[PDB]
Paper text:
Interactions between the monomers that form the face-to-face dimer in M(NLS-88R)-acidic, M(NLS-88E)-acidic or M(NLS-88E)-neutral involve hydrophobic contacts (mainly between the symmetry-related helices H6, and between helices H9 and loops L9), as well as several hydrogen-bond and/or salt-bridge interactions. When compared to the M(NLS-88E)-neutral dimer interface, the positively charged Lys104 side-chain in M(NLS-88R)-acidic has reoriented to avoid close contact with the positively charged opposing Arg88. This additional inter-subunit interaction may explain why it took longer for M(NLS-88R) M1 to disintegrate in vitro at pH 5.5 than wt-M1, as the fulcrum of M(NLS-88R)-acidic was relatively difficult to break during the dimer interface rotation. Of note, the face-to-face dimeric interaction is stronger than the face-to-back monomeric interaction as indicated by the BLI data.
As the most abundant viral protein encoded by the M gene segment, matrix protein 1 (M1) forms a shell underneath a host cell-derived lipid biolayer to connect the vRNPs with the viral envelope in mature virions. The full-length M1 protein includes 252 amino acids consisting of a highly organized N-terminal domain and a flexible but less ordered C-terminal domain that are linked by a protease-sensitive loop. So far, only the N-terminal domain of M1 has been structurally resolved at an atomic level, showing that at neutral pH the physiological monomers have a high tendency to oligomerize via a so-called ‘face-to-back’ arrangement, whereas at acidic pH the N-terminal domain exists as a dimeric structure in a so-called ‘face-to-face’ arrangement.
Residue numbers in the entry:
A (entry chain B), B (entry chain A): 2 to 158
The structure:
């Protein structure tokens, strides 16, 4: 299941312990269409301890895509910094290169496979590019990108 | 003064009429620091008739850059959508290339010079990288980048 897969890849990069079962629960409620309202979750996430800025950025990216509507909720600075690729032009170049390819994909698996050739930083930057409205993709591709990003991050630990 | 320079360049891409006189006054007010709030200014811009999304975006970039502080105001969706080079991979590729060079640039004239070598689309995309926190440049250089963008847009007109 698309969302089942997303949850597994996302949690893989989340520290073990209490907070993790919290993210699992919130992720599942949002996926089930339950716990509505994007800015409440985002603010909760922004202020959570233990989580690294990147994993918050990755989660922030997920909630933003999965909630029915974000309304006029502006994109969060905290997420924007986390997915900034460290302002490294090299990551950016790769990000755009990767974006150019994902642009024609519409399936989760097709998107996941092409993005796995890139570094975790290149992928986070691509995510950033999409989160910042400068790049656009389908929900399934965005999710593939997230999973590849998580896989890459996880396999480096 | 670099600022009055930015004003003229920015004003060059605004159509004539009473609205242009107001933009001029608000810019001059910001420069003199007539204690103007960013949220207030951005909402004003956002809702102006006549001005196109691009002009609105360019002006929004100048205001956030010259206000004393954003006061924690999240970046605006209307600007992000205006400065995304139309989400085109090529303008984006060129933008990253220009950013890569502006990064090491330190003067207004130098940034402007190199900037004028790129297309208007790659310049708006570049302004987007800055506005989205994906890249970072010294103010004077950013000032160079906007004037270049305006010069290229004014020329094609």
């Amino acid at each position: 299941s698309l969302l089942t897969e997303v949850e597994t890849y996302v949690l893989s990069i989340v520290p073990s312990g209490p907070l993790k079962a919290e993210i699992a629960q919130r992720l599942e409620d949002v996926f089930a269409g339950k716990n509505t309202d994007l800015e409440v979750l985002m603010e909760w996430l922004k202020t959570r301890p233990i989580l690294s800025p990147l994993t918050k950025g990755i989660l922030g990216f997920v909630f933003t895509l999965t909630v029915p509507s974000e309304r006029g909720l502006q994109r969060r600075r905290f997420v924007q910094n986390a997915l900034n690729g460290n302002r490294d032009p090299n990551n950016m170049d790769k990000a755009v290169k990767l974006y150019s390819k994902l642009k024609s994909e519409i399936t989760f698996h097709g998107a996941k496979e092409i993005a796995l050739s890139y570094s975790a930083g290149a992928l986070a930057s691509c995510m950033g590019l999409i989160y910042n409205r400068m790049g656009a993709v389908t929900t399934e591709v965005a999710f593939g990108l997230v999973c590849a990003t998580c896989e890459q991050i996880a396999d480096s630990q």
